Each structure stands twice: as structure tokens, then as C-alpha cells.
Amino acid sequence: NYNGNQGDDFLTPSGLAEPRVEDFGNAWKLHGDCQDLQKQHSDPCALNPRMTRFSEEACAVLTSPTFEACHRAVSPLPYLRNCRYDVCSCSDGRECLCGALASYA
Amino acid sequence: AACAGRGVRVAWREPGRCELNCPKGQVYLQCGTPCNLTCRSLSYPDEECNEACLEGCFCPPGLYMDERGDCVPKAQCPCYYDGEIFQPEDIFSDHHTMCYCEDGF
Ligand SMILES: *[C@@H]1O[C@H](CO)[C@@H](O)[C@H](O)[C@H]1NC(C)=O
Ligand SMILES: [Ca+2]
């Protein structure tokens, strides 16, 4: 609702804020035959364990000294979570790495 | 062009007059086949094409013309679906479908 507050952004058309991001997002789906998302599986590296070592080692650049000038201008932590998710679960983790780093930059 | 409209083909261009110097990596042909020049021809191969061999700039025999008009191998062509453009090895799935881009299709 662009009101300066995070605490009500999970508002829904029923006028209540869902504490679950899944039920929040489901309440904004435009079509009735779309499946309701039951649970959002954070940290998808469990489904491809081969990817986790690279996902960590590569996305840790966001918290490395190269971004240190930015770390006090924008907090890197959401971008690091997004990066590790992206690299662990996408069609090409190199492109997803570059997209996450570009997103923080 | 009137000659070609009567089936007579003339090699009339010379370095002294009116060389059809080609864009990008393309090469001149006095007569080349239009039906298989573009990556769209890979993306819509079931569509019939019968247009005559004609003068112009064409990709070398193993390469297809991309959106920006340079010539790429068949594997590097993007794919066209519902009027949207997908890069090689792109995947998508939806409640009705699951599709991927390879060899321009
Ligand atoms: C287009 O078709 C001709 C045969 O009609 C073939 O010689 C040529 O290699 C084809 N072009 C490509 C890029 O495959
Ligand atoms: Ca708000």
C-alpha cells in the first residue's frame, strides 16, 4: 500500500494482513483455476545439493569488501538470500548470479 | 528486377558500380533462398513457404539471421512462442504447458 510501513504490506483484498507470504500472494491471484501455493520452500539448495557449495562461495561476494562502500547505503542481507536462492534454483546459475549481483549493484 | 521478373538473371553489379555491400556478417548472393534465412523460420517450420530465389544479403549456408541481423548457428537462435522471444535453453511451465527453446524451436 506504499504507506511507508513494512508491517502491513501483506494486506490482502479482504482487508487483513496475512502473516504467511503464501496466503498473502494467493489472495492476489487473478484466476480461480490457479493452484494456491501451500508452502514457500525457502533455501532450495536442498533439492540440488551439488549447487550449494558454489552458491555460497559465489554469492558471498555481496558481503565481501568489493561491496563494502554499499553495505551501509543498502543492507546486503535480502540480496544475499535472494542470490543464494537464485543460484541454487534456476536454469543457469551463472546468469542468476550475475542477475543477483546486478540487482544489489 | 524486370529481367528477374522474366526469369533472366544478370550479374550487373561490379566494383565500379552499385555493389550491394552487406550488413553485419552477411554475404551477397545474386540469388538466395529467402524461406530459411531467419531464426523465425526455425521457430515456425510447419508454415509453408514458396517464395522464389532472389537477390540480397544472406547468412553463410550454416547460419541463421538473428533479431539484430547478425548470423548465428542454429543452436544459438532464440525461439518465438505466443509472440514472445525466448533465448536458447530457456525453460518455462504453466498449468497447461511445459516448453523449452532449442535449435530455434
Ligand atoms: C537453407 O536451405 C538451403 C537449401 O534450400 C540450404 O542449402 C541452406 O544450408 C539452408 N540454410 C541454413 C542456414 O540451414
Ligand atoms: Ca505498507
User: Angle at CA B23, nearest 5°, toward B19 and B26?
Assistant: 90
Identify the DSSP state of A89.
S
For the Cβ of B71 lying below 6 angstroms from any atom of ligand 1, the answer is no
Identify the DSSP state of A37.
P
User: Which of residues 18 through 37 in chain A touch B, CB cutoff 8 A?
Assistant: 33-35
Q: Reduced to 3 DSSP states, what percent helix, strand and coil does chain B have, rounded to the nearest 5?
A: 10, 30, 55
Q: CA-CA distance, B39 to B103, in Å (whole number)? A: 9
Please give, rounded to a whole number of angstroms, the shortest distance from the CA of B13 to a CA of chain A.
46
Q: CA-CA distance, A94 to A56, in Å (whole number)? A: 13
Task: Determine whether the interchain pair A92/B89 forms a contact, defined as Cβ–Cβ distance below 8 Å.
Answer: yes
Grid coordinates representing A60 are 558471498
Please give, rounded to a whole number of angstroms, the shortest distance from the CA of B76 to a CA of chain A.
16
For the Cβ of B58 lying below 6 angstroms from any atom of ligand 1, the answer is no
Alpha-helix runs per DSSP H in B29-103: 39-43
Task: Tell me how long chain B is.
Answer: 105
Resolution for this PDB entry, in angstroms: 3.1
Q: CA-CA distance, A76 to A98, in Å (whole number)? A: 15
Q: What residues of chain B lie within 8 A of the CB of A33, using their CB?
A: 95
For the Cβ of B63 lying below 6 angstroms from any atom of ligand 1, the answer is yes
Technique employed here was cryo-EM
For residues A11, A13, A14, A16, the Cα torsion angle rounded to the nearest 10 degrees is 0
Q: Which amino acid is at B101?
A: C
| Those residues with Cβ within 8 angstroms of residue B57's Cβ, 6 or more apart along the chain or in another chain | B20, B22, B23, B26, B27, B28, B29
How does strand B71-73 pair with strand B79-81? unpaired
Q: How many angstroms separate the Cα of B83 from the Cα of each of A11, A16, A104, B47?
A: 35, 39, 31, 15
